[PDB]
Symmetry: C8
Subunit: 191 residues, 8 copies
Amino acid sequence: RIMVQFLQANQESFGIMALASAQMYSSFEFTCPCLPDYNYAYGIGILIVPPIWFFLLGYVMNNNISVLTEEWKRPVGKPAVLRYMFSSMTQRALIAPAVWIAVTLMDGKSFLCAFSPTADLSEFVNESYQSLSQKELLKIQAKIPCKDIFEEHEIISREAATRYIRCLSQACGWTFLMVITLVAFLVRAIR
Amino acid sequence: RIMVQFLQANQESFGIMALASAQMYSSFEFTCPCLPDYNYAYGIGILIVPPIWFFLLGYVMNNNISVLTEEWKRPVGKPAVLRYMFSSMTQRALIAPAVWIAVTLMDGKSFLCAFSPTADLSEFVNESYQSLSQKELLKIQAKIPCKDIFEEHEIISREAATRYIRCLSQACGWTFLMVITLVAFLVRAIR
Amino acid sequence: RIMVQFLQANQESFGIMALASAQMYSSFEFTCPCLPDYNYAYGIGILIVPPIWFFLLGYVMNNNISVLTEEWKRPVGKPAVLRYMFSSMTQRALIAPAVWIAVTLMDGKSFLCAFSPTADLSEFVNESYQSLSQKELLKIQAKIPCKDIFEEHEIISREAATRYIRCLSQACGWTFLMVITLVAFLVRAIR
Amino acid sequence: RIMVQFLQANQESFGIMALASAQMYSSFEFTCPCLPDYNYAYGIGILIVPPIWFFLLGYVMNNNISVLTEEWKRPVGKPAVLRYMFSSMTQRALIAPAVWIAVTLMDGKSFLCAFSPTADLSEFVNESYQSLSQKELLKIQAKIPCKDIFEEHEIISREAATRYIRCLSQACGWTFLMVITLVAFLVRAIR
Amino acid sequence: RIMVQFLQANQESFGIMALASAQMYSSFEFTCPCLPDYNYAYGIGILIVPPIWFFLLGYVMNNNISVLTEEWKRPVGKPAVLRYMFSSMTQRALIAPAVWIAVTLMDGKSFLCAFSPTADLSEFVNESYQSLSQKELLKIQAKIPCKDIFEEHEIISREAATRYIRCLSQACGWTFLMVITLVAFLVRAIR
Amino acid sequence: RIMVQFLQANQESFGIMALASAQMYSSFEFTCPCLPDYNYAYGIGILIVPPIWFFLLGYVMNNNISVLTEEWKRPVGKPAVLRYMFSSMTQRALIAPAVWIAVTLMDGKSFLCAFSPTADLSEFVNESYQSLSQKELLKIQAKIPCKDIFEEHEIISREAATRYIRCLSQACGWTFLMVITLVAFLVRAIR
Amino acid sequence: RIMVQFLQANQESFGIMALASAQMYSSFEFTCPCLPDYNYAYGIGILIVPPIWFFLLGYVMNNNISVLTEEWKRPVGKPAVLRYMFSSMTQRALIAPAVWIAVTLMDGKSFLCAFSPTADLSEFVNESYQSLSQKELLKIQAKIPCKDIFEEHEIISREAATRYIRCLSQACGWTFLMVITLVAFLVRAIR
Amino acid sequence: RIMVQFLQANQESFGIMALASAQMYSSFEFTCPCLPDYNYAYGIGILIVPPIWFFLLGYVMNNNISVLTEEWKRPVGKPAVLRYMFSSMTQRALIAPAVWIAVTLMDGKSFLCAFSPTADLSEFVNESYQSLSQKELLKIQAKIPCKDIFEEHEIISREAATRYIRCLSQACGWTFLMVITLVAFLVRAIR
Ligand SMILES: *[C@@H]1O[C@H](CO)[C@@H](O)[C@H](O)[C@H]1NC(C)=O
Ligand SMILES: *[C@@H]1O[C@H](CO)[C@@H](O)[C@H](O)[C@H]1NC(C)=O
Ligand SMILES: *[C@@H]1O[C@H](CO)[C@@H](O)[C@H](O)[C@H]1NC(C)=O
Ligand SMILES: *[C@@H]1O[C@H](CO)[C@@H](O)[C@H](O)[C@H]1NC(C)=O
Ligand SMILES: *[C@@H]1O[C@H](CO)[C@@H](O)[C@H](O)[C@H]1NC(C)=O
Ligand SMILES: *[C@@H]1O[C@H](CO)[C@@H](O)[C@H](O)[C@H]1NC(C)=O
Ligand SMILES: *[C@@H]1O[C@H](CO)[C@@H](O)[C@H](O)[C@H]1NC(C)=O
Ligand SMILES: *[C@@H]1O[C@H](CO)[C@@H](O)[C@H](O)[C@H]1NC(C)=O
């Protein structure tokens, strides 16, 4: 509900592809497969491929890609403005992927789905079953991001590990935001 | 509720047939027949025939199809602009079917209805009835997309297979979106 | 709730009689009599007579029917434009009945009320009472479209047959829409 | 709730007395007396006298009734336009009563209150008390339109007869609408 | 809730004192004292004195009462227009009391509070206590319009008599409306 | 909820201090102390001192009180207009106190808090404890306006006396309104 | 909810710092520490320091404090207007603190938190524990303003003392308002 | 809910980065890890790094940082206005971090997460386990800010310590606000 709330707040306060990516995330049914084999793949895919598609889309929506390919295709184009126009296009296009990554990291769903089956959750596993094959722990830990599937509360506290992984995800998200802001500052200060 | 939410978000942010197809999907009562004989037919039909109707409709709503058929009908028309006008009409018309397919794939209802009776769900079938005729499994698996009909929780976990098939559907949807975006990029870069 | 939702969406997106028929359907209390003698009559009547009334109404609301009857009544009218004006009036009037039929077919209430008592529901009738007089089955099947009246769950699963008949109705509705769109395409391409 | 919904839809789509009558019906507390002596009187009265009052009101709100009575009162008026003006006034006034009758017939409350005590409900009366004095059946059937008063479910199924009478009322309403539309068509085509 | 609904509908459709009286009734906490001595007084008072106050208020809000009293006070006023102005003022002022009376009669609260203790409710009194002093019946019948006070369901059915008295009140209200409309028609047709 | 409803209705229909006093009452947390010593004081205070403060405030908000005190302070002011200006100021200021008193009387909270401990409630006191010291009745009757404190239902029916006192309060309120309207009529008719 | 209601009413009716202070109070999470040592400190602090901060803020937001300090700093400023400008600034700034104090006194939360542990609540303490060390009563009375902490209903009725202290707070608030209004009247009448 | 309420109130009343930080806090899912090792780190991080990022962002969004770095980079710039422009930029940028810190201190979530495991809560620890190793108390106290994890109500009252720490946080927040306002007053009065 917080994501939809901030969506409405951004709409009220309101370059546009940022809101598009935010809305698409807030209205995308993230469903972790909750299986030890496809958890990592699904999480990393949701993290990686939507920003790639947003990058391509931002390139396509640009009204002057045709002139770029026309000049790049000719031997002697009717040239410097070309590099500048291409850099401007790339910079305008890179906004939506960054917004998507930041949003999906602050909301640690992809991180929880991806890193649950293999993470080291030893402070959460009950003291009784503290000696059992990690292959048995694989399925149980993989079922963690699923509320309606995880029916083994006697072995692992679900919320206790959920909060831990979500905090790690939020830390990674803030680190990403800081690095991106530093790079943007350097770019705006040099070029 | 997510589909209606994104519908309202698209309305707020707001060529028009895209919103028409999105609204028609969000307000269409998808009812899987939940029978081993008509599941596949119904799913594939909901996937296939609505985009065909949208294609035809987009052709009909075009204001200058009459001039196209008039020129194609004459031996010597009062011609090149004809191919260009036809290509432009087709490109404008192809938008709504793609939006419909993308929406109905991201929301894996048609996929779940179509591929449930014949898919290989062996990790979900209970260990007790792990040796029984696939003809008996046919009806049970066909009843999966129906919440109020599937009353055999002792044989197959419904949600566990629902998430699996829905994840496969979302993967197919993202693949479709990527391919369509690549084709659109090539088209806008060449012609 | 889906019908009212699409009504509001159409109002937001917004020749006018289409919305009138949609609203009138979404606000009409369809009550199947749930009797073996009047089910068919009521269903077919709700399917047939409202579009006839809409046709007549669309003819009446037309501002230039008076000139049409004046010219048709005279021996030598002060004539060709007459056939064209009449065809245009008929084409404008035929919109609301088609919208009504499409809506009431996509929402398989009339179909369920009409075809329930005589349809062949043998895969749904319980295995115990699989040998009983069809005259006894008549009343039970007729009571199917009534949630608060059908109190014989031990003989027929209500939802299982409801979904089946509703799917058949939706198939018929899509077929009707496709045929109508093809005819409209031919008309706009020829005349 | 359907009546209020269509009221709001009519307000959104929006000679005016039609909406006035619709609103007055949707906000009028219809209370059937549920007594064998006053049921018929109350139902027929709600059906008959409100349209008469609407007719009189529409005559009163007309701004040029004074000139009509002035000319009708004089021996030689300062005359043909008189008949035309009177006919136009009557036609404008006759709209609200028709709307009231149509609405109160489509919503079979008046019909249910009026015809319940004397109708022949023999397929609904339980098989046990299938032989008892019609004088005893009078009170029971009269109590049918009252949900909070009818406490004799062991003798007559309330909903089963309610649906039957309401279907009859809706049939009568559609017949009335068709006849009125035919008359309006003839009037607009002749005069 | 119906009164507030029609209040909002009147506000949307929207000489002004009519809406004022309607709003004041819909927001006035009618509390029947439910005592055999003050029931009649309270009901008749709520019926009678608010329209008197509305009449006086409508006279006061009139901007030209000062000139009326100035001319009526002088021996030879600087006269015919006086009678006309006074009649116009009275006619404009008489609107709000009529609206108040009509509203409070259609909503049979005042009638129920006033006429419950002395009315003849013999078909509703239980057959067991069908022979008891009317002085004992006085308190019980007086407690009828109070839902949270009437705790003698074994002697009189509350809803059965409530509907009866409310129907009588609605009949009286419709009679009042018809008489008022006839008088208004005669006035507008003569003067 | 009725007070807030009429507040919103007044806002929609919309000299201004009247709405200010109405809003302040509808948003003021009236808390009767429910003690035999402070009940009367609190009720009469809520009835009396807020209108005094409103009177003073209306005098202060007046933009030309400075000229009034300047002229009243001088021996020979640069005089008749003074009496008229002062009377106009007083008449404009007297509106809000009257509105406050009328509102707080129609909503018999202050009356109930003030007159409960000493009123004669003998028809409501149970027949068992019909002979006990009035000093014991003092606390019980004082606790009447408190729903969550009055825990002696076996001695006095709370709602039965609440309705009685509230009806008396509403009678007093209507009397006050009538007297005020008569005085206003006389003032507007003389001066 | 009453505070937010009056906030919305003030916003609808709508020098500005008054609404700012009202909003800040209605959206400030008042949490009494419910300890015998910090109750008084917290209550008096919430009563005292926010108006001081509002005073300072109103001084800072003033656009011409710089000229004031510039002239006060110079030996011979390029002087009388200085005293007038300073008085006007102070008078404009003193509004928000008064509004804050009035609001937080009418809503007797600070008073209840501050004066509960040491007040004399002897009519509320149960008759059984009417003889016990005031040191034991200290903690119990301090826990009074906390609904979820006060678990000693057998010793003191919580609501009975809450209403008493809240009534005292409202009396103090009305006294403050009257004194402030009198001072404002004198100021506007003299200077 | 109070934070969102004040967000909406600020939006209605409505340099812009203040609302941005407020919205971002009200829509940020604060999740305390509830572990004795990461509690302090997470709390202090949420308190410290978001204002740093807001500072950097406010520097980046400034349209004339490029001219600043251009002049600072040159040996002899085409200089005094430089220091003034830089000071103005820094002052404009310092607003959002202060708003973030004030908001997150008034809402004592970060303080509660950070200082719970090591604070001295001896008046809240039950009298039975008043003698146990502080290492055992570490985990229990760390679990305090988690409602769904703290399942040791027999050792420490959760709400009693929550209110205490939240009150300390609010005191610190008000102190911070006072110091910031004093510094702003001095700055606006000197420079
Ligand atoms: C740990 O397991 C034991 C039994 O093996 C059970 O009683 C206990 O509740 C479990 N505790 C947790 C925290 O899982
Ligand atoms: C599997 O079947 C057994 C009995 O055949 C039943 O007790 C158990 O609950 C079932 N488990 C699942 C996951 O279906
Ligand atoms: C079929 O009938 C038997 C008894 O005749 C009953 O126990 C069973 O539940 C019924 N099943 C269905 C699906 O109607
Ligand atoms: C009919 O009456 C019998 C007893 O007389 C009762 O058991 C049965 O439920 C009733 N059925 C209906 C449909 O009223
Ligand atoms: C009538 O009274 C009898 C006992 O006197 C009671 O059993 C019955 O329920 C009552 N019926 C009504 C309708 O009050
Ligand atoms: C009156 O008191 C008796 C016992 O003293 C009790 O049983 C009865 O319910 C009470 N009635 C009322 C109306 O208080
Ligand atoms: C007073 O205390 C007694 C026992 O000490 C208890 O039974 C009673 O309910 C208490 N009453 C109040 C009002 O606290
Ligand atoms: C303190 O502990 C005892 C048992 O050790 C328990 O009965 C009591 O409820 C506890 N009280 C609190 C306030 O934790």
